[PDB]
Amino acid sequence: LGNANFENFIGATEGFSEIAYQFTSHILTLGYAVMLAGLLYFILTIKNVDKKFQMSNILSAVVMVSAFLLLYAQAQNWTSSFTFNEEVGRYFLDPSGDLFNNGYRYLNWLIDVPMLLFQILFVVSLTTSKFSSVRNQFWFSGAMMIITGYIGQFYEVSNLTAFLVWGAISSAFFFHILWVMKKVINEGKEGISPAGQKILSNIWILFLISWTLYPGAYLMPYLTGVDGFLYSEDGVMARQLVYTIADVSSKVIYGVLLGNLAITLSKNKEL
Numbered sequence: 001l002g003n004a005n006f007e008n009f010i011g012a013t014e015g016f017s018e019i020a021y022q023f024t025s026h027i028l029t030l031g032y033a034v035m036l037a038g039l040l041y042f043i044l045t046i047k048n049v050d051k052k053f054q055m056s057n058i059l060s061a062v063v064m065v066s067a068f069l070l071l072y073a074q075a076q077n078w079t080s081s082f083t084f085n086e087e088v089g090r091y092f093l094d095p096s097g098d099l100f101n102n103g104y105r106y107l108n109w110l111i112d113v114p115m116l117l118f119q120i121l122f123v124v125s126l127t128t129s130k131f132s133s134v135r136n137q138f139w140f141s142g143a144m145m146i147i148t149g150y151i152g153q154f155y156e157v158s159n160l161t162a163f164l165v166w167g168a169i170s171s172a173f174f175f176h177i178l179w180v181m182k183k184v185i186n187e188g189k190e191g192i193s194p195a196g197q198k199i200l201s202n203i204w205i206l207f208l209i210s211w212t213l214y215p216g217a218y219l220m221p222y223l224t225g226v227d228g229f230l231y232s233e234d235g236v237m238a239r240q241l242v243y244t245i246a247d248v249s250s251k252v253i254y255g256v257l258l259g260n261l262a263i264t265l266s267k268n269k270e271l
């Protein structure tokens, strides 16, 4: 019953404190709420950039749609999966619920990772690289990263070595994506205004950090060891919190910066 994931495992054994249960619930709600807000932002501001850049706004909006819907479903899956026991005063896994399921989040990643990588190619111009090459490489490596991570995700309770080995494999595809993105951003800096170069530098830093947060949260409950402080409901809170910080940063803030970058490259900005 507490076999699928670390959330259920904890939920089925120690249970969650009211703080943990409520905090995790609140943070997941904030997550999907921000997505909805972002959806409207990206719809409303689309006329602020030239036609040639609008595919980036379009991909942002779509990412917002998928992340709102799936994070909303994730938020409900958390709350409905754990119920309060008066005798002990903690929340436990509910046999009559459907149990906490990582599926919503990983599906969201599968859908969104290729669009996010894709959309910067409609703002920035490449230099010595082919569009189709960059695109195909993002999409393959991106697909493999989530797939492999999702494989590892099944063994987090039952086989911690499979969990890490697969996560390592996933980290290999991630490293490759970083490497392509580096080339993309540096080629995109050439020729453009220093104001656009500056925004591109910010996008690199945002991208590097916010995406590295995901394997951070994947590893979170074991960052202190087998009997460590994080190997608890605290690890769940931290993991869920980091995932949410990452989602907002990699989707909404990334989208906003690309929007601002697009405006810098506008037709009437040219002499």
Ligand SMILES: *C/C=C(C)/C=C/C=C(C)/C=C/C1=C(C)CCCC1(C)C
Pocket (backbone or CB within 6 Å): 108, 109, 112, 113, 116, 145, 146, 149, 150, 167, 168, 170, 171, 174, 211, 212, 214, 215, 218, 247, 250, 251
């Ligand atoms: C909007 C959602 C995004 C940008 C999701 C990104 C997810 C990742 C970069 C996940 C990476 C992982 C690893 C590199 C290793 C461990 C397993 C994953 C899937 C968490």
